[PDB]
Amino acid sequence: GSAKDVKFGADARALMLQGVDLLADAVAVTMGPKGRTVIIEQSWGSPKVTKDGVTVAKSIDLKDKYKNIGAKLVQDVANNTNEEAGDGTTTATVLARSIAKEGFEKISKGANPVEIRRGVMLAVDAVIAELKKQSKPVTTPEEIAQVATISANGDKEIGNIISDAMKKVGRKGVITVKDGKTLNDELEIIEGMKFDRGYISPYFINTSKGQKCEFQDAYVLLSEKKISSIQSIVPALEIANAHRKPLVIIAEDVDGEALSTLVLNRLKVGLQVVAVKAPGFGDNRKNQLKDMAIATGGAVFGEEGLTLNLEDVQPHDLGKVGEVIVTKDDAMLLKGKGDKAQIEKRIQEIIEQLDVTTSEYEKEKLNERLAKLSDGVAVLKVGGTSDVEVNEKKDRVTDALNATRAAVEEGIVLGGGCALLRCIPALDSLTPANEDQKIGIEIIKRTLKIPAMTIAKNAGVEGSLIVEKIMQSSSEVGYDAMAGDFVNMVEKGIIDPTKVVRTALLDAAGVASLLTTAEVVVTEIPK
Amino acid sequence: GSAKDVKFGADARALMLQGVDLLADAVAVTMGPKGRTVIIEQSWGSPKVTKDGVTVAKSIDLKDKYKNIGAKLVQDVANNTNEEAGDGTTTATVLARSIAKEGFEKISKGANPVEIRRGVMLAVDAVIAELKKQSKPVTTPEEIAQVATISANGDKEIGNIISDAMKKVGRKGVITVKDGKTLNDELEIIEGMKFDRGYISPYFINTSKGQKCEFQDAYVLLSEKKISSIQSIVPALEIANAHRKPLVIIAEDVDGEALSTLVLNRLKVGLQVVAVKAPGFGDNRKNQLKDMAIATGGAVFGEEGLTLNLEDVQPHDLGKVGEVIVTKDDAMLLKGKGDKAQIEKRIQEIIEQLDVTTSEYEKEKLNERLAKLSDGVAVLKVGGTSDVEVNEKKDRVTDALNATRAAVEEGIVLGGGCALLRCIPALDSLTPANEDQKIGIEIIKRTLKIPAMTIAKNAGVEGSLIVEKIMQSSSEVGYDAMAGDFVNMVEKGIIDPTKVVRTALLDAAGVASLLTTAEVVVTEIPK
Amino acid sequence: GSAKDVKFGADARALMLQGVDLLADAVAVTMGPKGRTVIIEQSWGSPKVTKDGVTVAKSIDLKDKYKNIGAKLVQDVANNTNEEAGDGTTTATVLARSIAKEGFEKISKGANPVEIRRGVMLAVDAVIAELKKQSKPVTTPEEIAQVATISANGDKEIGNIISDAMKKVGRKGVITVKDGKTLNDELEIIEGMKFDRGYISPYFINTSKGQKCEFQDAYVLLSEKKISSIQSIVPALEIANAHRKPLVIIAEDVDGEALSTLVLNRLKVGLQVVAVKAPGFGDNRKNQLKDMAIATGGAVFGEEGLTLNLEDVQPHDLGKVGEVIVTKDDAMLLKGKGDKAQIEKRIQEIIEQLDVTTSEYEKEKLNERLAKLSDGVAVLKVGGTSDVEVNEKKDRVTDALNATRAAVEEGIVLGGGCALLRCIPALDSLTPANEDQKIGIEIIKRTLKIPAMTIAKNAGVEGSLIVEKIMQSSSEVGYDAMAGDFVNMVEKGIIDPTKVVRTALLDAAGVASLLTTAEVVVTEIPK
Numbered sequence A, B, C: 001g002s003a004k005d006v007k008f009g010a011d012a013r014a015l016m017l018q019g020v021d022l023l024a025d026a027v028a029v030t031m032g033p034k035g036r037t038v039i040i041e042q043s044w045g046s047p048k049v050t051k052d053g054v055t056v057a058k059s060i061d062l063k064d065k066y067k068n069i070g071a072k073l074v075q076d077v078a079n080n081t082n083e084e085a086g087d088g089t090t091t092a093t094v095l096a097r098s099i100a101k102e103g104f105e106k107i108s109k110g111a112n113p114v115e116i117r118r119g120v121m122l123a124v125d126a127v128i129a130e131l132k133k134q135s136k137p138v139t140t141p142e143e144i145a146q147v148a149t150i151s152a153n154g155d156k157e158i159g160n161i162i163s164d165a166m167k168k169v170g171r172k173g174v175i176t177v178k179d180g181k182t183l184n185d186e187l188e189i190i191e192g193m194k195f196d197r198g199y200i201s202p203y204f205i206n207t208s209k210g211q212k213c214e215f216q217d218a219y220v221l222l223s224e225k226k227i228s229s230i231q232s233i234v235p236a237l238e239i240a241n242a243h244r245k246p247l248v249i250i251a252e253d254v255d256g257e258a259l260s261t262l263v264l265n266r267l268k269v270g271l272q273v274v275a276v277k278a279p280g281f282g283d284n285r286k287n288q289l290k291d292m293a294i295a296t297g298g299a300v301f302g303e304e305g306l307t308l309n310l311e312d313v314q315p316h317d318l319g320k321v322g323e324v325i326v327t328k329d330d331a332m333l334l335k336g337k338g339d340k341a342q343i344e345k346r347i348q349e350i351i352e353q354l355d356v357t358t359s360e361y362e363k364e365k366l367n368e369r370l371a372k373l374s375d376g377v378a379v380l381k382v383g384g385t386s387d388v389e390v391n392e393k394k395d396r397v398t399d400a401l402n403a404t405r406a407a408v409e410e411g412i413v414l415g416g417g418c419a420l421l422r423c424i425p426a427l428d429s430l431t432p433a434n435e436d437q438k439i440g441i442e443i444i445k446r447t448l449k450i451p452a453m454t455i456a457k458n459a460g461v462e463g464s465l466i467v468e469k470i471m472q473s474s475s476e477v478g479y480d481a482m483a484g485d486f487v488n489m490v491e492k493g494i495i496d497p498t499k500v501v502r503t504a505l506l507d508a509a510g511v512a513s514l515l516t517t518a519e520v521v522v523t524e525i526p527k
Ligand SMILES: Nc1ncnc2c1ncn2[C@@H]1O[C@H](COP(=O)(O)OP(=O)(O)OP(=O)(O)O)[C@@H](O)[C@H]1O
Pocket: A030, A031, A032, A033, A035, A051, A052, A053, A054, A086, A087, A088, A089, A090, A091, A092, A150, A151, A154, A399, A414, A415, A416, A417, A451, A455, A479, A480, A481, A482, A483, A494, A495, A496
């Protein structure tokens, strides 16, 4: 119902190309090892300094609506590349700008831009096939460190710390990046089953040196129902007193009467007991409770289906741990005495639960439960003297982790934009159906030189001469823009994930070739 | 979604440098002993006069958003220096402006500002290592008075009063600054356990000369629960009457029945009794009650875990004090007869509780409880004729206290900016990795002369000649800008905390070297 | 977060001096016996005509924020002088303007304004010491009348009425200024225990000539609790009827049953009784009832602590008065037959209560209770034909009362600004530490001539010649600007309180010397 403005043909295409050019010129200064940073003002406080392509892209909107349409389309390119791969958003931005510009230049009266888009997609399919042909899998942790170092803008310490984390918790393990209160980055490996619930009562502390409660070779009593009655807690204390062993009671809550009995026995006579709240807020809480019961070799009390009551507890019904530590904010369990076959059965049940999940929030919970069962988690705390530096380094650490995961799952190719440079003869071996498909193939062929040219241009040298020298060299030889020399890319460690490269190319081409099919642009009249 | 303005390169860098220069020029007039003050207009009332760098920094925002970005970044520098150290914010501001200016001057086509930032950080690490090498610990109260005098803009009385406070309550004791109703500053030492709760009933006054209640060698009855029944108070009164000794009932509250019994026994027959509310509003109330019971050698009645009732009071169960003073707004306990070993055990329990605490509010409560247990607290009341003078002097007193604590924990170096001046040959003994790292090292080397130059410039002399005369002199010789003479800085008392200097340098460098890496600035279009 | 404007140095200082000069020029026309008045527009109603310096100062705000900062600082000077002394705000304003102007003129590149402020404070301390040296105590009521006459702009009737009030109720008694419906001012002395509560029932009138209840030698029944039941009031009526004496019942309230019994006995059989609500609204009500019980020799029934009951009343328990007057809006008790020792004990208890309070509202209640127990209160009703004249005269009456109290508590010095003129040789005896302290001492030395110059300037003569003639004359000789001659100021009654002069000088100097230390002024952008 709102009044609209309508533009036709070359003027509208030039306006959207101006928007695409502005956004891509802002993004492209951050590309490569000699790329610079972008400062974006934030309304609520300190500005954000970033080297991330999708962060620069998503922070740009234009007053002109025709320019803003192209800006939003390249924003879609960068956001899709960030969601699919987690890296390569600047490459996707410059590839999309190149495809849009070369497609806008090729539109005439007799041209058919839809068939040009068809040829573009055929050429991109050929290039992706060649990229999959020339890729090799990751076999050594040195390649992991090299990938994480290249993806973190040459930071060797970030790559080394990611390699150490992947050595400790596994290449498919859980690694989480967070802030740090120190100047330097640190890696913390959390082993066993550690959850975010401390002790209910502060009188359970038997080690005042760290304000924590520690036991060795303790019984574990697991329950989903809240323990409140005297009769629900006396028999477990009777087993723990008869066998002279400590007892940790993990439950949803411990109410007043049961906690009064526990604190009275802890203080007056010296009973080794500690109460712990059950982590989770629903079905995840019961799933985690079952995981600790399986790991400790105990059964869960207050089951909704099995109906196990706390008034008849057996010594075999209690789990066992070699070590437990409970603090103010967290509790952890070490060396559970559970049966290994049941632990493995729960592990593959979690794995089969991971096969069918699309919410991308239950997937993280299942991965966390698998890590707590198998090998623990890794926490990367990013150091810095201020919040802006911490955020700037955290973006690079997240990029390096995403690229390391992509390289683990799909392999590596040559870095520096040389992987796309070696797929040009695959396009030279193509037979187009007509003239418009040939135009699209030539558009993709000219676009394939763009990332290496941008990386060389950001280093202060002429990118066309560098690209020609790379193409005239052997397949293993590329350009190192840090040292500024022509080297062996694999031996020098300049490598890229295959998934990142193909994702950036496909996501750029799909939106840019559709943008180049436009004849009429309809916008709203600015009020 | 809002429309944005995008600027590239030298114009955006010049605008950010204009904002940084404006804020730093406003801050830099307050530096040194000949620095002046800044008047900031307050909307709600009287303007604020200050000599504090972070106060001037946080009070400046610019209508130009490109200038405001640099202003916010140097605001972050000043605020981080204030949060980590509590002093040295003007030095951090001028160092950050110098690093930003010299890094903006050094950007060209072939320059790599990220490697320049790497060299800046390496040079700052070398300078911090040299500062820790040249630092010496504080060993005498004369050095404490000298540090507090230098940090309070040459006020000898503030330094003397801080030295007296640190002599009385300890160098790690609790000292609190507040306003004063008198012209002159005063120091009040609160010894023993004094809390903010007065008597419940005004009929408990036995000393009408000061409208207060005083007893000597009194029993103490401490209750975690509110005393409400008559039967909960008859046995304690019976013990106090049989032993003929005063009773101080520290409880959560006293209801109508127990209070009427207390006033009736006070007035009709002459029972020496007084009732006082338990200080605190939660877990801290029970913690303070436990510390009072441990110091007085008694037990807390109505315990949530131990379940001690007030109907079974014993003479050994009651605590003892040598003197208790009860005032309308406060009550205090002197010479508790508690066991020294249990008091020491509670003291190290509080100390170990202090080791694991990051909330920075429980830390203050634990420090206050430790001070009430060990050595009391100190209160500095700042004098003046108006609120603006009191606030202006209170800023300097807070600065002097922060610098004194920093000098206690980390030692002292030469004042007047000479400590950074003596770390230049440590940078001269550095081998850069490449040209950009060499550029960053030279940036830090030129920046290291800035604080002494600013201090000398604020004194009306040429700072470059003064700086050159300092470097041509011995390592113990610096410039006194008050006398305007070249002196021995340790013998004249012109010294600085090492922590303040390294904090200011690191916080300036970390943000300014990241600001100098910028190529594109994105701001919001002003509505 | 709001956008700010920042000004540096001489331009900012000139704008602040423009604001200070505007507000001080408006204030200074009201100074001395030949000062004029200022009309301030009020939004709600009629404009206000005043000769008060703090009233003129607080009513001025400027659109220019740089000028408004200086205006607010001189407002702070005037308000601090008004709150500390109650008089001398015009003198403080002109002294502050002089110190600000002389400090602004003396700022150069080599000047240190903080040391100038230190020298200003040292000189002001020397002048205050000389003022305390030359002060004389007040010994005669003629000096009281002279002080109150000078402070009331030469009004001899106001001074005489204040001297009469201080003669009747004491020099430290309670005197309250209020409006008058008559053309002329009047002084009313309220003796005994008069409070703002009338009788509960209009049937208690036994003297309809003034619509009042009139009894001689009456029993008094004082109750802290409400009297509602029949049996709560029958025994007291039985003692009153048996001894054949009138009964005034001062209680919190009287409910329907007891009131109906009282009115039935008053109308039918002719019982001399009257019921009166207890004055106060809380703890002050109980305190006032206790003072009435002590003064009348009775006891308070329904006390919360002692728990006295109205069902067992003894003839000695009731208080006695020689005369009680009950009026529709107020009730008074005369010739209480209480024990003199207990009255004195209550008086010293109230006196000791006054030394441990700072709320300034409980102090008024304590002083009112002490006046009702010892000497009564005085009410000055200010006459006039309109509200504007009544307010204008009430400001001068309040000024004269404040100056009379200050002269009682601290003594008197020479008026007309001659007391500050005689302190100049004390500054001539000073030895400055450096050049900036010498500058500050010279600033204060030139400032000391300002009040006499302003008083002579308002009289229409050249103030510099007058000040030179005063300084060349004897120490007892000053300038009567009212008569325009040179006289003995003590013999002519032209005297000032020492407290007012030293308060005005200290309050002016403390703010103005801090204002002259500024280099940067930060204001908000006017929206
Ligand atoms: N020393 C180097 N020499 C040559 N090329 C390099 C070097 N280091 C990195 N590269 C290449 O530079 C590219 C990395 O650029 P950059 O990480 O800034 O952008 P991106 O991966 O496209 O996107 P994002 O901004 O999301 O990280 C990769 O192609 C990588 O192979």
